[PDB]
């Protein structure tokens, strides 16, 4: 259909139409009956309780998609290379890229081969040259992604501050990353958003932590999420063993959004923040909720 | 028999890396020869077992140990457990009536 | 697919080092002598930056 | 007595601390009234993130000690670390010939 | 009828439902009346 | 300390209104009470001065959801062995080995 | 039909009527077969005995509610509105209304997502603009209730009395909450109605507890439901640590009612006394019981 | 069809045409739904996260291809000649070539009898003289192989260098071969092509190792993939035993090539030095892979 | 749709796939956990 | 036919026919030959 | 079910404005000379903030 249009680019760049408008041009057209693909798995937590189980909370679970597409040609030739194609658009180490467009923009999910693909039909494919590919593929990152937005603010002051904008228009919270450029002293916002997962949901509505004066030639990438290290010095040195016991915990809660404020000081030669905001969906598509 | 030689003279291997094979160290003893401590040999130039020149012979020198059981992601093994522990006590007390 | 991008192989590089932090770094590796043969000198009695 | 504190109001560190007396029940005819009034002893907390299975952080209380209840292993144990202790303490007690 | 079904599973014996954490408990028990008796109250 | 008088004379007479005013009262309080308690734990490692002074120097801190499972005990006087496992691509678990 | 009617009051305060009159105007219909819905589930527990098995007692469970819906619209980007509005109105940590209204009037289920929705049918449902979505949601209150009966006695005496009339015309027990002011000394009736679970029934007939005595400003919520802390004064003063193992032990129970007394004394002020009798039921719908 | 044959030749050498053109002249053919046939199984290898499960990794697994033939002759006698000579051709301690030819090349399977084979119908075969066999065969090396590359270079220098240009062009990594003549001491290359297996990949971009010196008569051959022991001497002398702990750590990945360097001292006599490049697939035919 | 098979199962519980020698070990951990830093050094 | 039935539940290992008992006394069996030569004679 | 209903214990409440934006925004409604009656002006002149 024209409302929905499903593409995938592979390990190599290869670029595939399997549904909506041009589906089939390269060959491959998607089947029905795909399982997985919209919503995020997400198992509850529950606990005992006086009136049976009490909740105790979520925990999202990676996307174990199982579909079907098919790879169809005139003459078995030009079909081989359809399939051979087909197949090396996918790989178990790397991932590749499956985008969905609506009216609601493009969100795609990066997605690998969870086991080996089971093709053709019970006789050699050669005989149709029409064949269907039964793929199983997993989301490690189980939410669908929108392109982050990317702010840059450079200063040549020694003290600068800055108001970055910023705003949570998913479903699910994101984490921040910052790249800070040496030598300097920043400031950035841990503001809680009212998340109240470490009780202090309240106290740390204004919170701001203050980095470890970074020296010449030292920058920094902090990110905020729990997959990477917070702190990483581009040239291997141990800021984060300068740092005291502090750490961001906080991500942007959906609907949250306000102008965090940015402090460097201490800045000879200025300095350089750049903060990337990532933008996940739970659905491959949805009207804008606040 | 002493099959680790670590008390020899010529000493032997206490680590190495799969890309530098072996490191050759001798032990050194400090004051009262209670501690001994580990210091390599910068150039190594221990000669070769002649049983290593010799046909059939499979077996590890004590004086040259040759080897390393690799696991990556085609490893021929199933390694299991592989633990590492620090030291405990700085001090000991050993004594009673003299 | 080698048209539109660029290998690491195929790629000119350029590297800097100035141990004025008074620290090595993991990008230089010790040969010969082993590990903690390196060392940075400060070098203060001249007006003069430090020197590995 | 053990306890395993669910979702249950008691918050453990902050309520209740290690060594304080608590009072708690057990849902058995003839003992319903009764409340056994013991320091606590011992509070474990325990998370398991496994997909498979998935514990969140839970706090499990034991109230008073027994050596009676307690398990074979830790009894073992114990007698083991007191017979050492007493071997060295005799070893050291020994006047020499 | 019970020959090659549920009545036969119960011949397989804990083949369908049976738990671990009981008849671990169940062990443990059996090993305690074993040996509490003669460990030393010490 | 809002007496019953001076919360009527708030809500300008309405006993309902004043009582739905303590009653939000008392559930800001609850609610407070099961944030402390359903609050992640902060795991944080720290190591020795590698040049040999004193105090403690800060190494990481691993996140809760990024534990695989973990289990801490508190004992009345007795020795605890605490236990973190960590998936061996986490920055911690690296730095450990 | 007009003799039952199902809405759903979503986390966002969005009104879907599934079923009964008016149901689909907002574009989402009820299907039919929906479980764990009507009576509340109960274990009942057993001992070995002489004879076979003893009763041991009963337990409530959560309820687990499987069920299906179905959004539809001629368009399908307002069929796209449709399903993302009935998205949102779900959630996983905060729970939506379910409310069922019938000639006995209207009682509501508190319920939240237990897992992800699996929406649509094995093609792409922008062809069809009507597409189902199956959910299972999840009440871990697994009782029916509708407004409680709130009852309100202010003094001016410094030592006074009152009796609350109250009667538990469901068919589950129900805990009563109190709202008592400050500064007082409170004596609440603990009841047994003839309860004999501590075996205690008729001993513990016209129990009355002592509160203790609440300094200016510690007005106090009484709730004696086992889900929360009986005793929480509002200036956040430990009323329960001052209140030496003392508890409420027993719920009205159903059939049973009476003029609780509620006794007020040292109140130089004269406070005031709110009880709150929860209307709990196993049913979406049933006649009063006797 | 003739897009595709597919041979076996058994243990004895016998000559069996299953499928393509010529099939069932010897009397067997192959019957359809033949599975693990086409891609090697990969399981892979998942670690929990703050997100669900992250990647931790991929195993290849061996195959288990179950597939029937039917073997047929006008005359039941014959038949028995037929299916005895099929039965003959198979073996569960040795294995059996199975070959897959198409446009892209001959691709070969390595198969062995996992189980006793399940002959016949119900009634006697001797009634048709028609009959089918299922086999359940078993690859312990999954991947579909080709004759390797082979390059000689020899030289009558004591010191000299020679390049040999090495591309994997297939889709899986390869492990290469040495065979290197003596006296003499060696160095070859064990470069990564960027393989952060080890987390050295742009380290060990240039990785060269050499081998102990070799004494008279001791020629060597180097195999670097891991179900063989590394250094074998011709004599049976203990190369390896002498080598230090080293290794060759990396295989050739797919789509890298380059002129890797040999050298060679310290050789009066001048020796010879020979590199086997496998080619293994995952699949009986592919397009070439860049 | 639940009510009735493998989310039954699961309500069963280690009817079917769970295995032996993980809950062994699991078990022997939490011993060891309990009984580790109470045995002596010697 | 295999890939889904009894052949990959034996894949999937001690779901069906396996009981605790053999697997417990195997255990203690293994635990005894490790312990039991080190075990005094008194 | 409700004996009363009662008017919610509405708090304090707080709003700001500075029009440093585009234009004029929704939270501004016009009256009397009907939507789209209202506009930013620079004043640049001056070097001052923007004004409604």
Redo the contacts between chains.
Sequence with gaps: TDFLKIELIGRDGSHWVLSGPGMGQQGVTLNPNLQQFYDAPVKTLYVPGPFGEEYAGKRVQRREIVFSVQAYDEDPDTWSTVDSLWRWAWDYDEESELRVSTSDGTRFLKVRLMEEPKPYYEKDPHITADNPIVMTVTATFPYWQDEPEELIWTTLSTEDMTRFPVRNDGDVPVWLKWTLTAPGLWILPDFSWGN????R?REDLGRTVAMPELVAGEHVSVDSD?????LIAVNGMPT??R?????LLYPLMPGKGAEIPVQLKNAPEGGACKLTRPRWYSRPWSRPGV | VDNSNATALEGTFFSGTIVDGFARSVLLYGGGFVEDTLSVVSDDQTLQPDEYYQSGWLATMAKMPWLVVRDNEWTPIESSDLSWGPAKNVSVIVGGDN | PLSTVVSPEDSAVQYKANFVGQYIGPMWKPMGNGWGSLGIHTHALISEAPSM | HLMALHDS?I?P??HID??QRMGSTVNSKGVENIVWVN????????????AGQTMP?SWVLKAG?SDRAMSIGERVARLAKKMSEALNNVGVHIVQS | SSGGGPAVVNNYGDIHTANYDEFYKGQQRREAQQQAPILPVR | ?????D?LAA?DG?????????????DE??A??????R????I?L?MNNPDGSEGL?????V??????????????N????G?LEL???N?LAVWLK
Tied chains: 1, 7, 8.
């Design positions: 109240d997962m470490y009780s949901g729990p997959r990477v290290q917070t984060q063993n740092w005291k016991g502090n750490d | 109001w918050i560190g902050l290690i060594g320091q606590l002893e011992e509070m474990t907390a325990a998370w398991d993130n496994s952080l000690k | 300390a809002n007496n019953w008088t919360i809500s309405d006993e309902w209104a004043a009582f739905k005013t303590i009653e939000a009262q008392a309080v609850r407070g009470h099961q944030a402390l308690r609050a992640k734990p902060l944080r720290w120097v800060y190494v990481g801190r996140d809760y959801d990024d534990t695989i499972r973990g289990s801490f005990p508190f004992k009345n007795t020795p605890s062995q236990v998936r061996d691509d920055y």
